[PDB]
Amino acid sequence: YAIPVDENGHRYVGLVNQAMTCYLNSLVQSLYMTPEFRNAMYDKKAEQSIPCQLQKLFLLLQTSENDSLETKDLTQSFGWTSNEAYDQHDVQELCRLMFDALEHKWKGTEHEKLIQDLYRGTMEDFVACLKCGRESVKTDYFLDLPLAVKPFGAIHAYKSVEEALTAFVQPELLDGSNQYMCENCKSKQDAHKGLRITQFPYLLTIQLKRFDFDYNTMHRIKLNDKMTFPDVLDLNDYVCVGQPIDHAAVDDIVKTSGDNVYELFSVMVHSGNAAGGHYFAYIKNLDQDRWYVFNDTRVDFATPLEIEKSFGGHPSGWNQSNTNAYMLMYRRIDPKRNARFILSNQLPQH
Amino acid sequence: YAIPVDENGHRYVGLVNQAMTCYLNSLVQSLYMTPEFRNAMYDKKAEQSIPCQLQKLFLLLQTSENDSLETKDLTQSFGWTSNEAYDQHDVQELCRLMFDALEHKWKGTEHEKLIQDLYRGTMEDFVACLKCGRESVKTDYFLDLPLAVKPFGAIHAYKSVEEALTAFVQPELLDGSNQYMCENCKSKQDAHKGLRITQFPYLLTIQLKRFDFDYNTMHRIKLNDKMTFPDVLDLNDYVCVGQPIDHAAVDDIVKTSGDNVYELFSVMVHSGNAAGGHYFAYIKNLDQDRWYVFNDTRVDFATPLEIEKSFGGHPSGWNQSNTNAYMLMYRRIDPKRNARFILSNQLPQH
Ligand SMILES: [Zn+2]
Ligand SMILES: [Zn+2]
């Protein structure tokens, strides 16, 4: 008989219908439900600024009592006036456009390193000669973890996010026909080439490569292979029901067995055909550890079965009603860094 | 002491410098050196029409005695006025834009089926239940053969185009966690899902997926793994030095062992960094069986070693001067269908 309310005791507010906006609503809500992000969003006409429109929409989403909110001014601030704008852009491009604008405005403030302190991880890609042992390494940064679901030529698709991440750090063996020209050996030798992660982001974004673009269609296509992912992700080695409520204790056990533990709080999913389909997301309020389904004008309680179905699985054919997740958002579990949503009664003005 | 001349005894004409046009010149020349395509290109102000600009450029490339030609009117007919237009588009998108315009103009003529008669192959993607044996198939068309070089998580990259094509038709096994919901079995069962080719195009285009787009850069990246490809490609099973002159006899031997034999005539390659680099192509005149390097304002004789280097291979590091091929163009060997370049003295007017 209850209703979804915010930490403030205020009803959750939805967004307008996804009139070809695709991932837009799911992305906005997922960012609005990030504590550090929303907390940082507070402190001629510059109405075209992405930060100001995002700040107006966040304040409305937190204080307004309506059911749905408009996103016409936000997509105007992006400059994406075309009707097919979101069909021709990946969600990662929109995340980069918003983060670039926020970084450009926050330059010189106490939030100029905020975006990279939250979302940036560091890895290094190397080439290790197997004869002499010398390496050539270069350090890379990343804001996403781009994991494939079913690689080209694969006989089995990855059954879990962990399995895809393991293959993501798998060293490629450079032998036979494509050996490596070693400078120390001054000749072609067998070698290892690949990635290795040195620091995961504080806010971990995982892209599940279900969406591909067929150029012969030329429309979007989507893999429906089943891939699992937990609420508590243990990534210590890189340096099945998780939908219900988290263990406060097992997380401490994993902390005693490594420091890189992550808590799932956003599951952005898609249904129907890939040439469009219906986008929405399952987002968890981290302060109250409660899951909710954010679907356009309707924010409702989410059940563990509803979220668990987003693991995917091949249906009967091209019927073809099926919902699976394409993006995941985790937050590192640090009882010292982890911030809570500041309450609405702490806002200075309106 | 000789000079590259056309079948007409006329010197080959180059194009202007690739001022951020990337694959444009290599694509134009490869289409201009296709016999059926160039032969079909002959028979308010509609200057914005893609076909008319392509026809003007082809006639100039065939009759003009200059060294280089301008491509400003062609890129204007595309509508790609932006300086970063070719950086933000794949070459397959440009091929589709040109073919769509040609098909739209050729509608109702004797060339309305020309584009699909030359470049379109047919395949079918299926789901075969391993218990009951029933299949659900749907027929697909394709203008490209998108072959990966190094798939996600792969330990070894494909050493040849044939190996990547074999993995391209490799059936995925749907068992364990992602079984297939069979409608005849009314339950989840193990199954096979994948592609199988029923008819290769008369003009076979092969895309080598060396170019990927890193969203964390966010620039283009390129794999440098060595992958071979022959001049005589035997694709019978799907229904190392090939750079020198073709066997007229071995091709007949392969014809006695299957009908789908293809002759390589275009090798579009790229050098340097992927964030840009230098684009050019090795194209063969099929009438005279002679290889030439088309590099901007310079068309020269191509040696077998120059073309064989385009197989790739990992250099010493990120130095990183290295040239490898991203696209291949084959023509089916049919002494009845295979057309020759009609001579310039057969043109009606100028
Ligand atoms: Zn070495
Ligand atoms: Zn069955």
Numbering used by the authors:
A (entry chain A), B (entry chain A): 76 to 118, 133 to 328, 382 to 492
According to the publication:
Ubiquitin-specific protease 47 (USP47), a member of the USP family of deubiquitinating enzymes (DUBs), is involved in diverse cellular processes. USP47 is widely involved in tumor development, metastasis, and other processes while performing a more regulatory role in inflammatory responses, myocardial infarction, and neuronal development. The crystal structures of the catalytic domain, in its free and ubiquitin-bound states, reveal that the misaligned catalytic triads, ultimately, become aligned upon ubiquitin-binding, similar to USP7, thereby becoming ready for catalysis. Our study provides molecular details of USP47 regulation, substrate recognition, and the hotspots for drug discovery by targeting USP47.
We obtained crystals for cUSP47CD and determined the crystal structure at 2.6 Å resolution. The three molecules in an asymmetric unit have pairwise RMSD ≤ 0.65 Å for 316 Cα atoms. It revealed a canonical USP fold with three distinct subdomains: Thumb, Fingers, and Palm. The Fingers comprised four β strands in the center (β1, β2, β4, and β7), an α−helix (α7), and an additional two β strands (β5 and β6) at the tip that harbors four cysteine residues, which coordinates the structural Zn. In the apo form, the Sγ of the catalytic Cys97 was 10.0 Å from Nδ1 of His420 (insert), although the Nε2 of His420 made a hydrogen bond with Asn437 Oδ1. Therefore, the catalytic triads were incompetent for catalysis. In the free form, the His178 imidazole ring and the Trp169 indole ring form a π–π interaction, which hovers over a cluster of hydrophobic residues, e.g., Tyr98, Leu99, Ile139, Leu163, Phe167, Tyr175, Leu183, Leu186, and Met187 from α1, α5, and SL. The SL takes up a helical segment and puts the Tyr175 sidechain into the hydrophobic cluster. This couples with the rotation of the Tyr98 and the catalytic Cys97 away from the canonical active configuration. Arg309 in USP47 deserves special attention since it appears to stabilize BL1 conformation in the apo state, i.e., the guanidinium group of Arg309 stabilizes the switching loop by making H-bonds to His178, Asp179, Tyr175, and Tyr421 in all three molecules.
